[PDB]
Write a protein that holds these residues in place. Sequence first.
Motif, short mmCIF file in Angstrom:
data_model
loop_
_atom_site.label_atom_id
_atom_site.label_comp_id
_atom_site.label_asym_id
_atom_site.label_seq_id
_atom_site.Cartn_x
_atom_site.Cartn_y
_atom_site.Cartn_z
N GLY A 1 -9.16 -7.50 49.88
CA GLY A 1 -9.44 -6.74 51.06
C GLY A 1 -8.68 -7.14 52.30
O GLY A 1 -9.21 -6.99 53.40
N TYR A 2 -7.47 -7.64 52.16
CA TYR A 2 -6.64 -7.99 53.30
C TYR A 2 -5.75 -6.80 53.61
O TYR A 2 -4.75 -6.56 52.93
CB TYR A 2 -5.81 -9.23 53.04
N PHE A 42 -12.00 -0.53 51.34
CA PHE A 42 -12.56 -1.78 51.82
C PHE A 42 -12.92 -1.69 53.29
O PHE A 42 -13.82 -2.39 53.74
CB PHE A 42 -11.60 -2.94 51.62
N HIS A 43 -12.21 -0.87 54.04
CA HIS A 43 -12.53 -0.72 55.45
C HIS A 43 -13.78 0.12 55.66
O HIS A 43 -14.45 -0.03 56.68
CB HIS A 43 -11.33 -0.15 56.19
N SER A 73 0.19 3.68 61.49
CA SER A 73 0.89 4.21 60.34
C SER A 73 -0.04 4.58 59.19
O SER A 73 0.44 5.04 58.15
CB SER A 73 1.93 3.21 59.85
N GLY A 74 -1.33 4.36 59.33
CA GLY A 74 -2.28 4.74 58.30
C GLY A 74 -2.43 3.68 57.24
O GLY A 74 -1.54 2.87 57.00
N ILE A 75 -3.58 3.70 56.58
CA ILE A 75 -3.91 2.69 55.58
C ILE A 75 -3.98 3.34 54.20
O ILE A 75 -4.27 4.52 54.06
CB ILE A 75 -5.22 1.96 55.95
N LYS A 76 -3.68 2.53 53.19
CA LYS A 76 -3.60 2.95 51.79
C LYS A 76 -5.00 3.21 51.23
O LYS A 76 -5.98 2.75 51.81
CB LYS A 76 -2.89 1.87 51.00
N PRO A 77 -5.13 3.95 50.12
CA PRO A 77 -6.47 4.27 49.61
C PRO A 77 -7.28 3.09 49.11
O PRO A 77 -8.51 3.16 49.13
CB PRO A 77 -6.19 5.24 48.47
N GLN A 78 -6.64 2.02 48.64
CA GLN A 78 -7.40 0.84 48.25
C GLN A 78 -8.00 0.18 49.47
O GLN A 78 -9.18 -0.15 49.50
CB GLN A 78 -6.52 -0.16 47.51
#
Length: 49
Positions: free
Chosen positions: A1-2, A18-19, A9-14
């Motif tokens: 979860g790091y 976790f967020h 720029s947006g975060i990935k689906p994994q």
Amino acid sequence: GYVKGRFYSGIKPQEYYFHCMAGREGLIDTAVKTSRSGYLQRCLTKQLE
DNA sequence: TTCAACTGCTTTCGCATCCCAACTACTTTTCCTCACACTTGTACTCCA
């Protein structure tokens, strides 16, 4: 979860999943916070009136 | 000198059996329209 992603720029689906886990851990603590300090202050103010 | 029931308290406004009916029957309300048995002569001869 790091999460090395950023909100620019947006975060990935994994790391999107976790967020959402860290977003619900604060909301569930308010859900266990129905009536805490309303009767502590009433007991003080009745004696120390 | 201790165990075990009787014990009042968590907030702060406002939210939020009796009745009825169905359909089909049978019946009553009466008013209207005629017949069925009785009788004297008359007619056709009847016996005098």
